[PDB]
Design a protein around this ligand. Structure first.
Ligand SMILES: [Zn+2]
Ligand SMILES: [Zn+2]
Ligand SMILES: [Zn+2]
Ligand SMILES: [Zn+2]
Lengths: 213, 226
């Protein structure tokens, strides 16, 4: 094990911004480090080898520096194609470990989510299962907190979140949270709520429904 | 030029064996290290191991040592990755990649000789699940009582993928179709939602169009408010 860490873990930037990502190794590796770029759905692309060398076909706005324990990848003026995950990899000793990755996404002004809740359709209940869904539409930054409450009791281990990629046009995310329950538990209780906490909300927002109204 | 071509997506049940391949062209297969990288859904890259097809020397990550075997047949320019017994945790995309060398090889390759993965295959998706092929159940997500949201929940299908459109493609503005999520049951599920003017609910009809080619399902669901 040579273990690598990367900071920041996530980074918001604007076009033409100078951006820098650091990789730190658990021991001295000399120059034996590579940088890779990965875009969603695609295989990674080699940017830099031996800490400092630019692979052919890679634009010069990419650059590598470092030796030993500290390395940096710098993009001097960010272009739209540069919004992708970046991975460092040490090639000093096997296993040739990848760092955890840092995602560079697109910066914009804060946008609060619109929150909607959806109870289970009658059709679904024929099946013995009941899904209640909370939707957060069009918010930024990515960081968000969704809590389910039933009869004011906080739920856990019975929900799942799914998030979209950042929208190409308005640079926002949308997110669905899905609380799944057996029809029996579902009929047992009465009030269902999703509580949302996000930077663009001064106060956490709640949407709910009563199963008998 | 150089090209790495991997075998196709695989859907297997736990306990079954599997061998996926990567066929290379455009360079001397026997004289270059070539290796495998795993990427589980939504997470980073994991280096698994490399093999030198010339002398069949292999180097593995201890995390994968004993779980898999990397092997090659230089006779036919093909590298392999295999499991004798699959787990649900092995669900991932697997990349094969040439591990090429850069530099002069000064001091008999001990300085200025760097290894990096320069050419990659497209990847092979491997899904491990007890589930058998199953078409989706589609449930409406109805708008409540001036902007509204409605959608559809596409639940308990297998394998991926489904495609969702609204009103046969006429409505695109405002649709978010979320990435599918594998559930404990071994079945997939996702949601597709759309935002519309609250005023247009009485005046506009909205339909989920769902296709799941693997089970040959075409479903159309009206989503009505109440
Ligand atoms: Zn030092
Ligand atoms: Zn309960
Ligand atoms: Zn060579
Ligand atoms: Zn939206």
């Amino acid at each position: 094990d040579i273990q690598l860490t990367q900071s920041p873990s996530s980074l918001s930037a604007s076009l033409g911004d100078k951006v820098t990502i650091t990789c730190r190794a658990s021991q001295h590796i000399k120059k034996y480090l590579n940088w890779y770029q990965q875009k969603p759905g695609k295989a990674p692309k080699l940017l830099i080898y031996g800490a400092l060398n630019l692979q052919s076909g890679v634009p010069s706005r990419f650059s590598g520096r470092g030796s030993g324990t500290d390395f940096t990848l710098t993009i001097s003026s960010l272009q739209p194609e540069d919004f992708a995950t970046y991975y460092c990899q040490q090639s000093y000793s096997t296993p040739f470990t990848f760092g955890p990755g840092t995602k560079v996404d697109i910066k914009r002004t804060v946008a609060a989510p619109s929150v909607f809740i959806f109870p289970p359709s009658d059709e679904q209940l024929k099946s013995g299962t009941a899904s209640v869904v909370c939707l957060l539409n069009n918010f930024y930054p990515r960081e968000a907190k969704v809590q389910w409450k039933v009869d004011n009791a906080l739920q856990s281990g019975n929900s799942q979140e799914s998030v979209t990629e950042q929208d190409s046009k308005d640079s926002t995310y949308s997110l669905s949270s899905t609380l799944t329950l057996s029809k029996a538990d579902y009929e047992k209780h009465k009030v269902y709520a999703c509580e949302v906490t996000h930077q663009g909300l001064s106060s956490p927002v709640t949407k709910s429904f009563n199963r008998g109204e | 030029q150089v090209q790495l071509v991997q075998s196709g997506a695989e859907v297997k049940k736990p306990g079954e064996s599997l061998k996926i391949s990567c066929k290379v062209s455009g360079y001397n297969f026997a004289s270059e290290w070539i290796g495998w990288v795993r990427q589980m859904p939504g997470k980073g890259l994991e280096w698994m191991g490399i093999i030198y097809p010339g002398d069949s020397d292999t180097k593995y990550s201890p995390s994968f040592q004993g779980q898999v075997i990397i092997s090659a047949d230089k006779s036919i320019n093909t590298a392999y990755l295999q499991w004798s017994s699959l787990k649900a945790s092995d669900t991932a995309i697997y990349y094969c990649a040439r591990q090429n060398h850069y530099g002069s090889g000064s001091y008999f390759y001990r300085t200025a000789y760097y290894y990096a993965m320069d050419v990659w295959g497209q990847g092979t998706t491997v899904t491990v699940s007890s589930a058998s092929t199953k078409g989706p159940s589609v449930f409406p997500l109805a708008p409540s009582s001036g902007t509204a949201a409605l959608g559809c929940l596409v639940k308990d299908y297998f394998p991926e993928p489904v495609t969702v459109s609204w009103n046969s493609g006429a409505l695109t503005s405002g649709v978010h179709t979320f990435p599918a999520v594998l559930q404990s049951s071994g079945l997939y599920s996702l949601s597709s939602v759309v935002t519309v003017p609250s005023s247009s609910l009485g005046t506009q009809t909205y339909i989920c169009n769902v296709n799941h080619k693997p089970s040959n399902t075409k479903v159309d669901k009206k989503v009505e408010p109440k």
